[PDB]
């Protein structure tokens, strides 16, 4: 197999490691000279970083030698390939950083592209050093429910980049915690789509963007630093949306987007229709193309569900060097009020509404439940438009008794609030 001792790896300037860790595989990395980034986040010299169950590049800004250990890797198959599209990301950031200091308020960029083109990675890198160079707090807006970032899956989010991201996490970092940690956690703004993929409820997804946009505006109006800073909006692939791209128009208007980044080549006809479709609103001067990034590998479904699984655990228990202690509470059937969104394979159409849910072992076991701020007695119009407090896992639906075992993120009472069921399941 591999080996459980350290190995030296001299990684040439301008090159990526490119790593694909799978089940259980644990990679510890320690730098003793040079400059290395993971999507822009620098690695501190002389301390141990640990990686689990995700594919990621380690980039060499400078000369760089490091020590690594992993039983699932060997010197034989190591992969060290020179990245060329890196400079594209550089003079795209300083392009944004010029807008930040010259304009009255910072740029609001959508990163739009095909399936696995580098959107999220590009989003992360641009955040990663909007902060590194002149201390901005760009607002990062994740609009892809399948991608868990700072939260659990199945929800769009807005998160300001306070300081450094966690380099050793596919989820960028994590939400605030009860004490103080060696990394400054983030305060996210979550909305909860709740469903597997966008096409399951089109209007509800846009309704999410609607109310997320509103809140984003209210902070931008009140926070000088975030408003002065940029705003980086990551979208799902256009193979998840309509041909005419009706959704993008709605993203652009509700989130006040003024600049668009299209990860596109110059034989791809997507570039042309982007110009004719969004040029009228943004102006062709404000639409940019980026030749697709090096090293961006295909991602299958199993890996993606794995990453979603990791995040759910991560929300309740944290990571290796975080270790959060969530709370398990016994609760009656009457102690809960639960709704669920309209599907395609449930409601045929799929409109902005939620149906009351009867408690069935097949309905709630291992289900992630979104907890709102609205009352237990509120009507559906109030619940569909009330902010999300946090999430809860249901362990056991005992049906012979009227009882439930719910895992909470906070040690305390079951928040007597209205709750929405998701399509997301987690069993330990």
């Amino acid at each position: 197999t591999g080996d459980n001792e350290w190995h030296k790896l001299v990684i040439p300037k301008g090159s990526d490691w490119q790593i694909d860790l799978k089940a259980e595989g644990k990679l510890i990395v320690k730098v003793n000279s040079g400059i290395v980034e993971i999507f822009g986040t620098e690695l501190a010299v002389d301390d141990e970083y640990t990686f689990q169950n995700w594919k990621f590049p380690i980039y060499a800004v400078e000369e760089t030698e490091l020590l690594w250990k992993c039983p699932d890797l060997t010197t034989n198959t190591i992969t060290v390939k020179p990245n060329h599209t890196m400079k594209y990301i550089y003079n795209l950031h300083f392009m944004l950083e010029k807008i930040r200091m010259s304009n009255f308020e910072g740029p609001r960029v959508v990163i739009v592209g095909g399936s696995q083109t580098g959107k999220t990675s590009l989003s992360r890198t641009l955040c990663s050093y909007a902060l590194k160079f002149n201390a901005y707090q760009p607002l990062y807006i994740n609009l892809d429910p399948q991608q868990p970032i700072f939260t659990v899956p199945g929800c769009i989010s807005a998160t300001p980049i306070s300081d450094i991201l966690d380099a050793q996490l596919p989820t960028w970092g994590q939400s605030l915690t009860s004490g103080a940690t060696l990394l400054h956690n983030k305060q996210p703004m979550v909305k909860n789509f709740g469903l597997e993929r966008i096409n399951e409820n089109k209007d509800l997804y846009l309704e999410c963007i609607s109310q997320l946009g509103q809140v984003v505006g209210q902070r931008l109006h009140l926070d000088p630093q975030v408003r002065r800073s940029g705003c980086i909006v990551d979208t799902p692939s256009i193979s998840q949306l309509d041909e005419n791209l009706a959704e993008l128009h709605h993203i652009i208007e509700k989130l006040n987007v003024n600049i668009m980044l299209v990860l596109c080549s110059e034989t791809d006809p997507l570039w042309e229709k982007v110009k004719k479709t969004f040029g009228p609103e943004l102006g062709n001067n404000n639409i940019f193309f980026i030749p697709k990034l090096d090293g961006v590998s295909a991602v299958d479904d199993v890996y993606k569900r794995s990453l979603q699984r990791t995040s759910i655990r991560e929300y309740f228990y944290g990571s290796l060097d975080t270790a959060l202690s969530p709370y398990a509470i016994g609760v009656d059937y009457e102690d809960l009020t639960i709704w669920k969104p309209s599907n395609v394979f449930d409601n045929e159409v799929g409109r902005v509404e939620l149906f009351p849910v009867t408690i069935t072992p097949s309905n709630l076991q291992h289900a992630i439940i979104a907890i709102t701020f609205a009352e237990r007695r509120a009507d559906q119009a109030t619940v569909i438009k009330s902010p999300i407090l946090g999430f809860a896992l249901i362990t056991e639906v005992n049906e012979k008794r009227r009882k439930l075992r719910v895992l909470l993120p906070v040690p305390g009472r079951l928040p007597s609030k209205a709750m929405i069921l998701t399509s997301y399941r987690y069993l330990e």
């Binding site: 944290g318 999300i388 946090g390 906070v410």
Partner: peptide
């Protein structure tokens, strides 16, 4: 021994400054 926190409400997040975290 620590735990995850609840998120802030809509208005409450809008007023929030990340300098409190730092």
């Amino acid at each position: 021994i620590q735990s995850r926190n609840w998120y802030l409400s809509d208005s409450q997040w809008a007023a929030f400054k990340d300098d409190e975290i730092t």
